[PDB]
Design an enzyme around this catalytic site. Structure first.
Site: not given
Lengths: 92, 115, 114
Positions: B43, B50, B64, B111
């Site tokens: 994109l 970014r 995680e 976005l």
């Protein structure tokens, strides 16, 4: 700790360097907080190795896997540092 | 001096791959993360953004791996001790959830800003 | 999809646990929700709102991890003298660094904007 002063050095240097360079406030924030992400993760890894040292004598997959994973997390943080700095400095 | 670094890299590889193979809940996030990164790269957007989407994704990643480490420790205790509180794994899971919430929200706002 | 909803359940019980069991979790909770809301009240560049909130939530995540570590140390040193108080100490240190990041980030960003 020997290597914690190696990354301590890398972090303070990276911060200072990121401050000497005139840069958008947002971007100085990004560099700094990136290297600090590395910092925080390392301290956590220190904590883990501390607990793994507290309990157990022998090698286990259970015991080694933990430290290994900590080291991996640190590596990812540093990868983030490298990449972040790369893209930001390229943006110029 | 330089040997210590490559040894750390090695331990990092064996541990990252231990994390990969010894867990199937780390691969859902692996896919989601690499996909999110790639998508965030094809994109068009400003470099800072970014950096942000990607770093949100990677925040999730790091958290995680830490959770994996914790569960390894609890596996070790559960070997020795008999009863498990299970309050640790829960909180690890909670941390992961917060990271992902951050990912979702970050992506949402960014976005929305650009599009 | 239930293998996900169980994880969500575990997150929730582990968060009610982090919240209630630690009488101190709630403080940083207040500071973080306040910081977020305040950062949303301020009209700022979407990127910057994201950054403020990201710093704050970084603090949050680190805090929960510290709670996890503390739980582990609890199960172990139930009756056992420890050369590992340093684990919890490192945890607290990590939290401190996260908050330092929060303070500094907010400082620089608000200085930029104002």
């Amino acid at each position: 700790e020997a290597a914690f002063r190696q990354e301590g050095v890398a972090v303070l240097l990276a911060v200072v360097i990121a401050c000497w360079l005139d840069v958008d406030a947002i971007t100085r924030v990004l560099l700094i907080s990136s290297v600090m992400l590395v910092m925080i993760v390392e301290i956590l890894n220190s904590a883990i190795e501390a607990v793994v040292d507290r309990i157990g004598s022998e090698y286990h997959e259970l015991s080694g896997r933990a430290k290994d994973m900590g080291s991996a997390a640190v590596l990812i943080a540093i990868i983030v540092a490298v990449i972040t700095w790369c893209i930001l400095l390229w943006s110029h």
